[PDB]
Structure 1
Amino acid sequence: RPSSSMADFRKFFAKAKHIVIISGAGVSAESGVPTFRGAGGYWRKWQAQDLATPLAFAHNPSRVWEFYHYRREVMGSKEPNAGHRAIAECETRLGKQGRRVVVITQNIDELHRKAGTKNLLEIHGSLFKTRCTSCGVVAENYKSPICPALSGKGAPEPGTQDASIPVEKLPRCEEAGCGGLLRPHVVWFGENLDPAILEEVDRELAHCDLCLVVGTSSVVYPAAMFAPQVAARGVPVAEFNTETTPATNRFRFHFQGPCGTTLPEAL
């Protein structure tokens, strides 16, 4: 069934008054941005599903920041693409017209935010946000590097050497009289989700009259808990992906290829 109609699609898109846009790894990967919870591209000597766990920060905090210094870093040179932008501009327009567009995004790169998207829901946090592991405070952090110690430390290559920066040298909360060890405020495997962020997610799913999916779909994680709700209520689901045919899900629309291509036109 999954219609291939940018025709009718453009019909509902003109009709619908509260669009919710679930964003995917793909959207970020079309930029220049490094996926790791991905097929290949390990980061040095370890699995990245394996560095991004709470016990990693427990056994070597140093070499995890090592992993996220890099992350934070690499994106100095990466930009929002035509997808990030189509979506942004579409938000603005109908914004003053008189309609809500929302963007739900598992990604942590903040590329949507650079593109000018105001309604963002990053359901894994940002790697430009820190959490003090002591007085769980949260904070925009953009400093390059994050800690003098980490300057030059983080090398992509393998057989790179460790770093083993004494905890005390790692990122430390500036909160007056705290100084606990800073971690990345980014949802880890085994880790759960901002329940607030979820009750808004779920909120914008009951009230949405148009739903979009881009990058990584309803068949593949992290993206699923959101596909099911839309279909039952009686609401159309356009899926925009780069995954040719391999799949386990279908709905009112599917399109193909980069969302650089498609989206600009669509929205």
Structure 2
Amino acid sequence: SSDLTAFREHFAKAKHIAIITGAGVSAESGVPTFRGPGGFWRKWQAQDLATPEAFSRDPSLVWEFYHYRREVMRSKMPNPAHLAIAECEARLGQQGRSVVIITQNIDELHHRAGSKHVYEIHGSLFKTRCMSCGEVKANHKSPICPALDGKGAPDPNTKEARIPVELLPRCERKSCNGLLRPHVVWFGETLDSDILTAVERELEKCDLCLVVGTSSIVYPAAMFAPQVASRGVPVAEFNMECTPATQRFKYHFEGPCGSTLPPALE
């Protein structure tokens, strides 16, 4: 149902809220996803490049792609949904109540909004992993390494940089000097289990669940939300996915997250 008053009553009692956030939230901030029919980067779409095969085969190109994506983030900002969440978390923490964010997104926009207890289940554009020793290190450097400066242009006729692998980002522990890769979960890679076991703990604790910028019935929101709802915990969706009447969940608020969510949480 679309009765807000009802949702708010639950919100008022809730002591542990879990907010699952999907692509619609980053979409509203203007982040290109490179899925859709016009979402190309040069000749390719995300599924061509976000794979270990692509990286093994052509690390320069994949790096050019991720560089580009890291750099466009300097002009996309958190929208009102990002903020409403972060300010909620803070407000409730003062009161001893908990709020967590389980996000599919890799743009660090929740972090930029001021959220703190965030689980990035698909990793982040702004972390690296050493192909060699596996160290996971935060990185917001621009450019991530000199070799990539001014690289990553999106128009198809752009010339490959074909950066020698020795000059792509390397792991700075000089005992190792291993080749870095973005700590994102590519197509065909599993999620990290340490994270899943945390998320599980969180979702078992939670007495209210919000699904924002996605639906509970779509992968990977489906891993989490049904689990909670089957224990009789309310679930509120905020999306403008236009989800057909017949399988929206408990409460639905159709519309842009930026519009719907902040009044929900005030």
TM-score (structure 2 length as normaliser):
0.96
Asked if the contact 2:214–2:237 (Cα under 8 Å) also holds between the matched residues in 1, the reply is: no
Partners of 1:161 and 1:203 lie apart in 2 by 48
Partners of 1:79 and 1:90 lie apart in 2 by 18
Deviation at 1:64, TM superposition (A): 0.2
SS at structure 1 position matched to 2:252: strand
Q: Could you tell me the percent identity over the aligned residues? A: 76
Residue of structure 1 equivalent to 2:258: 260
Instruction: List per-residue Cα deviations over 1:119-178 (Å, max 9, x = no partner).
Output: 101001111000010010011111101111111110011121111111111111111221
Asked if the contact 1:20–1:205 (Cα under 8 Å) also holds between the matched residues in 2, the reply is: yes
Residue of structure 2 equivalent to 1:152: 150
Query: Equivalent residues in 2 for 1:134-213 (5 A)?
Result: 134-213=132-211
Structure with the largest fraction of helix: 2
Partners of 2:38 and 2:131 lie apart in 1 by 30
Asked if the contact 1:21–1:101 (Cα under 8 Å) also holds between the matched residues in 2, the reply is: yes
Deviation at 1:57, TM superposition (A): 0.6
SS at structure 1 position matched to 2:183: strand
Instruction: List per-residue Cα deviations over 1:158-199 (Å, max 9, x = no partner).
Output: 121111111111111111221111000111111111111000
- Which amino acid in 2 is paired with 1:249? Q
Partners of 1:121 and 1:72 lie apart in 2 by 19
State which drifts further: 248-257 or 124-133: 248-257
C-alpha change, 1:172 and 1:264, in structure 2 (3 Å) is same
TM-score (structure 1 length as normaliser):
0.96
Asked if the contact 1:219–1:247 (Cα under 8 Å) also holds between the matched residues in 2, the reply is: no
Residue of structure 2 equivalent to 1:102: 100
C-alpha change, 1:4 and 1:172, in structure 2 (3 Å) is same
Deviation at 1:224, TM superposition (A): 1.5
Partners of 1:50 and 1:249 lie apart in 2 by 32
- Which amino acid in 1 is paired with 2:190? N
Asked if the contact 2:215–2:243 (Cα under 8 Å) also holds between the matched residues in 1, the reply is: no
Aligned length: 265
State which drifts further: 162-171 or 243-252: 243-252
C-alpha change, 1:185 and 1:248, in structure 2 (3 Å) is farther
Gapped regions of structure 1 (runs ≥ 5): none
C-alpha change, 1:5 and 1:78, in structure 2 (3 Å) is same
Asked if the contact 1:218–1:249 (Cα under 8 Å) also holds between the matched residues in 2, the reply is: no
Residue of structure 2 equivalent to 1:251: 249
